[PDB]
Amino acid sequence: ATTLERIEKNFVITDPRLPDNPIIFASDSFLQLTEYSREEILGRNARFLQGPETDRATVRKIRDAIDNQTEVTVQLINYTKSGKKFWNLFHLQPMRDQKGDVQYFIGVQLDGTEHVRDAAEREGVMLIKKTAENIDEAAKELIKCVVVGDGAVGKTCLLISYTTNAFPGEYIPTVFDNYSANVMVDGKPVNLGLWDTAGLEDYDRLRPLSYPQTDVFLICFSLVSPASFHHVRAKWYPEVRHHCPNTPIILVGTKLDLRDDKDTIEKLKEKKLTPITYPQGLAMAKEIGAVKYLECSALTQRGLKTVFDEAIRAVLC
Ligand SMILES: Nc1nc2c(ncn2[C@@H]2O[C@H](COP(=O)(O)OP(=O)(O)OP(=O)(O)O)[C@@H](O)[C@H]2O)c(=O)[nH]1
Ligand SMILES: Cc1cc2nc3c(=O)[nH]c(=O)nc-3n(C[C@H](O)[C@H](O)[C@H](O)COP(=O)(O)O)c2cc1C
Ligand SMILES: [Cl-]
Ligand SMILES: [Cl-]
Ligand SMILES: [Cl-]
Numbered sequence: 001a002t003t004l005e006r007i008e009k010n011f012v013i014t015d016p017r018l019p020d021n022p023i024i025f026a027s028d029s030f031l032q033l034t035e036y037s038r039e040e041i042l043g044r045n046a047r048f049l050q051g052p053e054t055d056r057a058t059v060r061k062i063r064d065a066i067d068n069q070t071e072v073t074v075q076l077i078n079y080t081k082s083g084k085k086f087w088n089l090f091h092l093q094p095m096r097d098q099k100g101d102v103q104y105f106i107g108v109q110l111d112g113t114e115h116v117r118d119a120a121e122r123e124g125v126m127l128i129k130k131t132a133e134n135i136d137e138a139a140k141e142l143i144k145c146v147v148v149g150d151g152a153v154g155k156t157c158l159l160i161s162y163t164t165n166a167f168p169g170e171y172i173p174t175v176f177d178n179y180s181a182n183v184m185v186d187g188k189p190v191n192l193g194l195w196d197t198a199g200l201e202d203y204d205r206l207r208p209l210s211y212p213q214t215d216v217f218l219i220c221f222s223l224v225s226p227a228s229f230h231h232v233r234a235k236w237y238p239e240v241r242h243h244c245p246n247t248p249i250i251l252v253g254t255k256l257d258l259r260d261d262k263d264t265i266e267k268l269k270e271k272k273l274t275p276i277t278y279p280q281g282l283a284m285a286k287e288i289g290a291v292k293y294l295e296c297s298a299l300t301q302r303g304l305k306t307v308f309d310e311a312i313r314a315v316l317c
């Protein structure tokens with residue numbers, strides 16, 4: 001089937017398993033319409049589109065449809081980032097997995113200047129339902145990758161680095177967030193969705209909301225934090241396998257640039273520690289039955305593309 005990026009229509013896909021049903025994919029057309037960036041949109045509920053003139057009764061119809069896991073089509077006023085009003089002929093429908101249970105919601109927007117009626121409304125409704133069907137077929141091939149590991153090991157940074165080629169400043173702990181990549185693999189594009197999760201132990205009861213139907217896990221530890229490495233065996237491997245006994249795991253050693261960093265080596269020496277070496281990482285990967293061991297740096301990007309390329313190959317090949 002076609003891939004998601006070839007659908008030149010306004011739409012988003014949300015994950016209703018996560019708290020508050022956040023957007024996990026947004027089309028380029030949607031970004032253009034709404035004036036928001038992908039990093040501003042993913043991981044958030046789509047209600048940010050609403051504003052002063054939006055009919056709240058219409059919004060409640062959408063809420064009701066989602067709660068009942070049924071499709072609905074409505075028209076309501078929405079707003080771009082800069083505050084420009086538009087009418088949104090909006091269609092929502094659940095996407096079910098092979099077992100028939102709801103996995104995602106698909107939402108399609110047809111923007112205009114007016115509330116359309118009669119013939120024009122009928123035509124609009126027919127168009128967006130067709131679009132939703134096309135997205136459903138394409139979304140069946142979205143690869144779900146979930147990234148787990150101790151707090152501050154660099155999970156978020158490697159996702160931001162891979163998707164924007166930037167490096168983030170201030171450390172801000174994650175709850176959940178999502179990223180999207182379109183990756184060429186053997187000459188064909190693949191849609192990869194990346195679920196970022198919290199390393200904090202106090203998020204243990206929430207974290208597994210991200211786990212169902214995962215295609216591949218990245219378990220991450222920092223090459224310069226032995227505690228994070230030991231937690232791979234004691235915490236992360238057991239947790240992942242408890243929920244997903246059969247899903248491939250890639251073990252990822254992060255912060256590769258710090259392993260040969262003089263200040264870092266000295267600080268570890270003060271702690272009576274040394275960085276984790278490649279053979280040590282590889283041995284841990286073998287111990288936990290990981291399909292690959294990979295090392296990378298979000299900062300320099302060394303090894304970074306290979307992490308996601310191998311994640312996809314673990315699923316497709
Ligand atoms: N030198 C270096 N520092 C990094 C690298 N990746 C992450 N960092 C640093 O590590 C800190 C933690 O990075 P995050 O990506 O936010 O950590 P996380 O694993 O997402 O943490 P949680 O969201 O709390 O689970 C960052 O603020 C950076 O200072 C890297 O590749 N090299
Ligand atoms: C797939 C998906 C797409 C959505 N797209 C829009 C949108 O285009 N515009 C909008 O106003 N609300 C959209 N929503 C609806 C809001 O996310 C939310 O369900 C609605 O505001 C009602 O819930 P609330 O009362 O908790 O806000 C979308 C919801 C989902 C599931
Ligand atoms: Cl919602
Ligand atoms: Cl570290
Ligand atoms: Cl490096």
Ligand SMILES: [Mg+2]
Nearest residue numbers: 155156173174
């Ligand atoms: Mg994070």
